[PDB]
Structures are given as structure tokens and as C-alpha cells.
Amino acid sequence: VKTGIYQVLNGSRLCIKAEMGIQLIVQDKESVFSPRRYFNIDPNATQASGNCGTRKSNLLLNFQGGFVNLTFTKDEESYYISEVGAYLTVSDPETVYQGIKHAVVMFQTAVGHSFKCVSEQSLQLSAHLQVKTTDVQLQAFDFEDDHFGNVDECS
Ligand SMILES: *[C@@H]1O[C@H](CO)[C@@H](O)[C@H](O)[C@H]1NC(C)=O
Ligand SMILES: [Ir+3]
Ligand SMILES: [Ir+3]
């Protein structure tokens, strides 16, 4: 689970800066104790793009098989991840799994600061699809000379 360094821009100004490792867990079997399919987002094989905004942004990460979409909202003061979507193709059998969590308050951080959380974070997107983050340090909206803000933590 290698940590990727991602970035979203408004022409030249920094809109979103995100470092993290991301894993997708799909539950093949109806039995909750049965093994699951793991998929590591490989950062050297993943395209970051996304859309900046005064009150709402998104970091989208695309890879062969699908994507992970992190949507940010700033309430002011403070910003947070307000939505998470994912899409993942498995070759055999031949399934696309996907899911979106719509109304969440996640990694909420005082505006102008950065969020850090090296500890594994987790979110059920659908009933079978789960996303896990690790080694997270990110920041959105307010920036100062392309550096991480006054920092914060989770647990
Ligand atoms: C990513 O999120 C934005 C809203 O923040 C949305 O417009 C876009 O459709 C999403 N992308 C995907 C592929 O889910
Ligand atoms: Ir599903
Ligand atoms: Ir939190």
C-alpha cells in the first residue's frame, strides 16, 4: 500500500494537496467471515485530476479498473471530506463493484490547516465495497506557498 502524492490545481494555484495510501476491499462472498478481495491503489499508475471550488472541491484518482473520488466541502471555518465514491473492476468472475457515501463528515480540519492521519481509516461505501486510507496528509482550499498548514490529527 504505497503512499501517493496527489494534487489538484486552479490554473497555477494549489487547490488540493493529498498524500495517502488507498486500498479497496470487496466482499466477494455473502459470508462476512470469508476472505475478501484486496486492491492497492498503485500511485505510479494512477492519474490525479479534479475540480477546485470556493466551497466545494474534488480529488479524483483514476486507475486501470476504476477510480476513487474524494469530494471536499468547506463549512467555514473548517473543511472536510463530504463524499466518497469508488468504482472497481475485477476480471474474474467479471464484476464491477462500486459505491458512494454521500453525506459524511470525514477528516474535518480547521481551514488553513492540514489533516494528518497515519493510522488506518476506513469507510463502507456500499455493502460489499469498502475503502481504507493510510499515511494520510492532505489539505484543501486555503493554502500558503504550496506548504502544509498548521497540521492536525485524528487518533
Ligand atoms: C467526483 O465528485 C464530483 C463532485 O465533487 C462529481 O461532480 C463527479 O461526478 C465525481 N466523479 C465521479 C466519477 O464519481
Ligand atoms: Ir455493490
Ligand atoms: Ir475524524
Numbering used by the authors: 223 to 377
Please give the exact wording used by the authors of the publication that reports this structure.
LAMPs have been implicated in a multitude of cellular processes, including phagocytosis, autophagy, lipid transport and aging. The five human members of the LAMP protein family are characterized by a conserved 'LAMP domain' directly adjacent to the single transmembrane helix.
The crystal structure of the membrane-proximal domain of human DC-LAMP was solved by multi-wavelength anomalous dispersion (MAD) phasing and refined at a resolution of 2.8 Å. Two protein molecules denoted chain A and B are present in the asymmetric unit, which are related to each other by a two-fold non-crystallographic symmetry. The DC-LAMP domain consists of two β-sheets that form a "pseudo β-prism". The front β-sheet is bent in the middle by two connected β-bulges, which are formed by the β-strand pairs S2/S10 and S10/S9. This bending forms the domain's triangular prism shape and it opens a hydrophobic pocket between the sheets, constituting a possible binding site for small molecules. The first disulfide bond stabilizes the β-prism by linking its two sheets. The second disulfide bond, linking the front β-sheet and the domain's C-terminus, strengthens the connection of the C-terminal transmembrane helix to the center of the front β-sheet.
